[PDB]
């Protein structure tokens, strides 16, 4: 996260770290959506242009974390993956369309002060909250700058950007399965996701029921926190039917 701040303890208890077993390193962020299911970006697991194609046994999920590098004894819980499910129409060849994947855990994780699932939006909540200008929150342990690493979880609040502005910022073809967020050059404030934040949640707190909903998944950007550029996020609600189908059939 660029231009963010240290998270408070327990501020993002759905935050998940995807952790590579060998070598031991952060791979991506992700989010806890129930005691056995974790949501992330497809490109975290499968990206042929960079020879990335992880299998279940390559990875661990670390939940309840705050420190990036520490082993947080008695606080974090580390889980093995039973199965990975990548969206069948995930477009890695072009623009990361449908950049979404589910991971089933081998055993249910125990909820605690530091571990708790985020909500997924229903149509009404999405319609109400996904509006240009409305702010969401992005969290992660990724790079603090485009070209080091944070000691603890970083957080930044960012406004959703008008679709025409999103489209006009890039040569990449944007789809209805994506939205963009970030401040404009003239707004003065800044902030963005960066390398290592991929897969993490873009969340909003509903002013209707005061619950946190994951509206987006950190997906792609051209550089990090560049003027006139914006972060792109997978539109979680637009892909909700796939999410439910996977959980229904394999849950």
């Amino acid at each position: 996260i660029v231009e963010g701040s240290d998270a408070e303890i327990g501020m993002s208890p759905w935050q998940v770290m995807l952790f590579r077993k060998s070598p031991q390193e952060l791979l991506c962020g992700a989010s806890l959506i129930s005691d056995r299911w974790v949501l992330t970006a497809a490109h975290c697991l499968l990206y042929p242009p960079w020879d990335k194609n992880f299998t279940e046994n390559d990875l661990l999920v670390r939940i309840g974390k705050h420190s990036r590098t520490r082993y947080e004894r008695n606080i974090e819980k580390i889980s093995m993956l039973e199965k990975i499910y990548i969206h069948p129409r995930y477009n890695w060849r072009e623009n990361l369309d449908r950049d979404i994947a589910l991971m089933k855990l081998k055993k249910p994780v125990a909820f605690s002060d530091y571990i708790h699932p985020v909500c997924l939006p229903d149509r009404e909540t999405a319609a109400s909250l996904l509006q240009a200008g409305y702010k969401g929150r992005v969290t992660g342990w990724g790079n603090l700058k485009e070209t080091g690493q944070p000691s603890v979880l970083q957080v930044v609040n960012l406004p959703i950007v008008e679709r025409p502005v999103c489209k006009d910022s890039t040569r990449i073809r944007i789809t209805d399965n994506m939205f963009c967020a970030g401040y404009k050059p003239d707004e003065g404030k800044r902030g963005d996701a960066c390398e290592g934040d991929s897969g993490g949640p873009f969340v909003m707190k509903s002013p209707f029921n005061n619950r946190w909903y994951q509206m987006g998944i950190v997906s792609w950007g051209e550089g990090c926190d560049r003027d006139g550029k914006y972060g792109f996020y997978t539109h979680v609600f637009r892909l909700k039917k796939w999410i439910q189908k996977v959980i229904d059939q394999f849950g």
Binding site: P23, Q24, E25, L60, T69, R70, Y71, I78, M80
Partner: peptide
């Protein structure tokens, strides 16, 4: 590789 080792049980 600046990560503290996790318990062997997880690996």
């Amino acid at each position: 590789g600046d990560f503290e080792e996790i318990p062997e049980e997880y690996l």
